[PDB]
C-alpha cells in the first residue's frame, strides 16, 4: 500500500 497507509 505504501504512502497512503502511512499518512492517508
Amino acid at each position: 500500500c505504501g504512502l497512503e497507509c502511512n499518512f492517508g
Partner: antibody
Amino acid sequence: DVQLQESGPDLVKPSQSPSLTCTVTGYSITSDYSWHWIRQFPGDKLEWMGYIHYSGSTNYNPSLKSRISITRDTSKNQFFLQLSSVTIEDTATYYCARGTIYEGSLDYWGQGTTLTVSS
Amino acid sequence: DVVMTQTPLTLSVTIGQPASISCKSSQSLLYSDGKTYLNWLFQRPGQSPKRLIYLVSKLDSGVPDRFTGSGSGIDFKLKISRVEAEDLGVYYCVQGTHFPQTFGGGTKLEIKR
C-alpha cells in the same frame, strides 16, 4: 507555532492496559494532517506505531495491528494511544507527531513521555 | 519492512570540518507518484527528535544551509559543510514511501579529540 505535549503514567505493571495522551495546541487535529505515535527503545531504536487521520480514520504497524489502538477527542483537541496486555519490552519513550502525506514525513515532534514497565 | 542501513555507526569530527552520513535502503524509495520520501531526523541525548530534511533534499524551517541532502533509488546522503557544536547528537534516516514507516539505526556524531 504548533506544539505537542505527551502525558500519562510513568510506571506501569506488566499485563496491564495503560493509555497515553497527546495534547496539541496551535492547530486543529480535525483540519488537515495525520497524527502519529512513535516509540524509542533503549539503544535509541525508533518504531512507528500508527496514526489517526484528520477524517478520523486509523492505521497501525502490521507488527502491532491487534495489540494497540488509537482514538481521539475532538472537543478536547487530543488523541490517545491504548496499550494492551503490556510487557517489560514495551519500556520506551513514547512520542506523538504530526504527519504530512505531501512531504511523506513527520514535521512536528513532542517532548515524549517515558513509560517504564516493571513489577 | 524496508531496512535502513546507516554508515557509519559513530562519526568523529573536528569542529569546523566536513562530515557525511550515508543511508542505504533494502528497497527503492521512489514512489509511483514520482517522489522519493526520505527524511533526516536529528536528536540530542535527553532531547526529543526534530526533522532536519524531508523529500531527500528539502531543508526544514530553522535548518542552516551548511546541511545538504542527496541521493535517489536506494542510496542517500546527508552532508554537513562544517560541523558546529549545535550539530552534535544522533542522526536518523527515515522513510515514508513503504508501509510501514521505518527508521535507520542512527549515526552518533561526536567531537574528535
